[PDB]
Design a protein around this motif. Structure first.
Motif, PDB file in Angstrom:
ATOM      1  N   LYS A 236      55.535  45.756 -33.563  1.00  0.00           N
ATOM      2  CA  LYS A 236      54.734  46.589 -34.548  1.00  0.00           C
ATOM      3  C   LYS A 236      53.373  46.146 -34.568  1.00  0.00           C
ATOM      4  N   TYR A 237      53.156  44.944 -34.358  1.00  0.00           N
ATOM      5  CA  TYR A 237      51.547  44.040 -34.341  1.00  0.00           C
ATOM      6  C   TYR A 237      51.170  44.038 -32.785  1.00  0.00           C
ATOM      7  N   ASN A 238      51.985  44.727 -31.857  1.00  0.00           N
ATOM      8  CA  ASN A 238      51.273  44.734 -30.580  1.00  0.00           C
ATOM      9  C   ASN A 238      51.626  43.196 -29.972  1.00  0.00           C
ATOM     10  N   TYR A 239      52.649  42.636 -30.200  1.00  0.00           N
ATOM     11  CA  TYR A 239      53.112  41.212 -29.700  1.00  0.00           C
ATOM     12  C   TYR A 239      54.203  41.174 -28.697  1.00  0.00           C
ATOM     13  N   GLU A 240      53.863  40.641 -27.725  1.00  0.00           N
ATOM     14  CA  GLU A 240      55.018  40.883 -26.462  1.00  0.00           C
ATOM     15  C   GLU A 240      56.307  40.055 -27.097  1.00  0.00           C
ATOM     16  N   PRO A 241      57.436  40.870 -26.488  1.00  0.00           N
ATOM     17  CA  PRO A 241      58.649  40.400 -26.878  1.00  0.00           C
ATOM     18  C   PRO A 241      59.052  38.939 -26.522  1.00  0.00           C
ATOM     19  N   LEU A 242      59.706  38.169 -27.395  1.00  0.00           N
ATOM     20  CA  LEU A 242      59.962  36.742 -27.257  1.00  0.00           C
ATOM     21  C   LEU A 242      61.450  36.929 -26.692  1.00  0.00           C
ATOM     22  N   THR A 243      61.593  36.239 -25.556  1.00  0.00           N
ATOM     23  CA  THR A 243      62.874  35.992 -24.803  1.00  0.00           C
ATOM     24  C   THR A 243      63.430  34.700 -25.165  1.00  0.00           C
ATOM     25  N   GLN A 244      64.718  34.787 -24.357  1.00  0.00           N
ATOM     26  CA  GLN A 244      65.446  33.194 -24.570  1.00  0.00           C
ATOM     27  C   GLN A 244      64.907  32.197 -23.620  1.00  0.00           C
ATOM     28  N   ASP A 245      64.244  32.689 -22.504  1.00  0.00           N
ATOM     29  CA  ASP A 245      63.538  31.886 -21.484  1.00  0.00           C
ATOM     30  C   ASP A 245      62.378  31.358 -22.297  1.00  0.00           C
ATOM     31  N   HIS A 246      61.599  32.118 -23.091  1.00  0.00           N
ATOM     32  CA  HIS A 246      60.725  31.661 -23.868  1.00  0.00           C
ATOM     33  C   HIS A 246      61.062  30.569 -24.884  1.00  0.00           C
ATOM     34  N   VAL A 247      61.990  30.694 -25.608  1.00  0.00           N
ATOM     35  CA  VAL A 247      62.896  29.840 -26.657  1.00  0.00           C
ATOM     36  C   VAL A 247      62.848  28.558 -25.942  1.00  0.00           C
ATOM     37  N   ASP A 248      63.571  28.572 -24.674  1.00  0.00           N
ATOM     38  CA  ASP A 248      63.914  27.253 -23.808  1.00  0.00           C
ATOM     39  C   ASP A 248      62.561  26.311 -23.448  1.00  0.00           C
ATOM     40  N   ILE A 249      61.443  27.475 -23.150  1.00  0.00           N
ATOM     41  CA  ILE A 249      60.167  26.612 -22.569  1.00  0.00           C
ATOM     42  C   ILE A 249      59.539  25.944 -23.688  1.00  0.00           C
ATOM     43  N   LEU A 250      59.999  26.366 -25.134  1.00  0.00           N
ATOM     44  CA  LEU A 250      59.184  26.107 -26.381  1.00  0.00           C
ATOM     45  C   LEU A 250      60.177  24.602 -26.833  1.00  0.00           C
ATOM     46  N   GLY A 251      61.300  24.232 -26.036  1.00  0.00           N
ATOM     47  CA  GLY A 251      62.256  23.367 -26.381  1.00  0.00           C
ATOM     48  C   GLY A 251      61.431  21.889 -26.585  1.00  0.00           C
TER      49      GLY A 251
END
Length: 305
Positions: A236-251
């Motif tokens: 709704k604020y024109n932010y890209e979807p956050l994925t499982q791949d993205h969550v794992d990169i932030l580990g």
């Protein structure tokens, strides 16, 4: 402590930058081994730029048309071909300063250092991100074309970007080093629209983890969330979807700080709704999306090259 927009050291790339002149036109080229890479629009006159036929223009051109200076020193062109939007000029001398290099194609969100050049000479270096609309918000003047974006891996230089074009909106378009454009842009003088520039959500979350590491914690909220609930609000604020791949990169950043990825999501959810209320994070009044999770680790862990 402290957190700055940081480029890789540019010394290794500086030694690969040369001037390429064809007729009147003058721009920058990349000299790796016995090949010089530059934008093919080098062969165009002002007339040609409106509607170039690069095959028909390149048919009439021969090796001797291309002036290449590496310093105040002539380089002999002994061959030329076209790979998409990039010209490859085979030269009689291999670059003795050629570092370990590779050509990669980056995804939207990935960052790189740009060595801005004019007449084959370095002007300066800055950090950029490939935007979701496949543009970059760089700093480029006339004759900047053929400036390259790179990442360093201890010894190896990964070339990911060559500058080809500015759009009337003032954002920039280019190719990888095989001459394929990022996004649907063409090397022609016509008005081209970039599209909706979205925020790289995973890069914002990375920058918030950097903030906590440098003892900037006020935005840490008392709510949590799910990945789906966060995404419904984000988009709704024109932010890209956050994925499982993205969550794992932030580990690794999650481990370092002891703050679950989904907790940091929830703090960002609140910031989007309530705003910053005049407050700053790492001395910034906006949320920053041009630091990758690896940029944050590099700068906080102290990786050398």
């Amino acid at each position: 402590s402290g957190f700055r927009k940081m480029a890789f050291p540019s010394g290794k790339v500086e030694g690969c930058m040369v001037q390429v002149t064809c007729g009147t036109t003058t721009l920058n080229g990349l000299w790796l081994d016995d090949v010089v890479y530059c934008p093919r629009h080098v062969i165009c006159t002002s007339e040609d730029m409106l509607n170039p036929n690069y095959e028909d223009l390149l048919i009439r051109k021969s090796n001797h048309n291309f002036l290449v200076q590496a310093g105040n020193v002539q380089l002999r062109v002994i061959g030329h071909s076209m790979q998409n939007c990039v010209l490859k000029l085979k030269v009689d001398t291999a670059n003795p300063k050629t570092p370990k290099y590779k050509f990669v194609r980056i995804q939207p969100g990935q960052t790189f250092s740009v060595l801005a050049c004019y007449n084959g000479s370095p002007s300066g270096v800055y950090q950029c991100a490939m935007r979701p609309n496949f543009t970059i918000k760089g700093s480029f003047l006339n004759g900047s074309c053929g400036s390259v974006g790179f990442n360093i891996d201890y010894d190896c230089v990964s070339f990911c970007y060559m500058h080809h074009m500015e759009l009337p909106t003032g954002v920039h378009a280019g190719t990888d080093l095989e001459g394929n454009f990022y996004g649907p842009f063409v090397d022609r003088q016509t008005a081209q629209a970039a599209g909706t520039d979205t925020t790289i959500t995973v890069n914002v979350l990375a920058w918030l983890y950097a903030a906590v590491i440098n003892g900037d914690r006020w935005f840490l909220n008392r709510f949590t969330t799910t990945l789906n609930d966060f995404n419904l609000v984000a988009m709704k604020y024109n932010y890209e979807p956050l994925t499982q791949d993205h969550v794992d990169i932030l580990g690794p950043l999650s481990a370092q700080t002891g703050i679950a990825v989904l907790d940091m999501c929830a703090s960002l959810k609140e910031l989007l709704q309530n705003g910053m209320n005049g407050r700053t994070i790492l001395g910034s009044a906006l949320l920053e999306d041009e630091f990758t999770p690896f940029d944050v680790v590099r700068q906080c862990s102290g990786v050398t090259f």
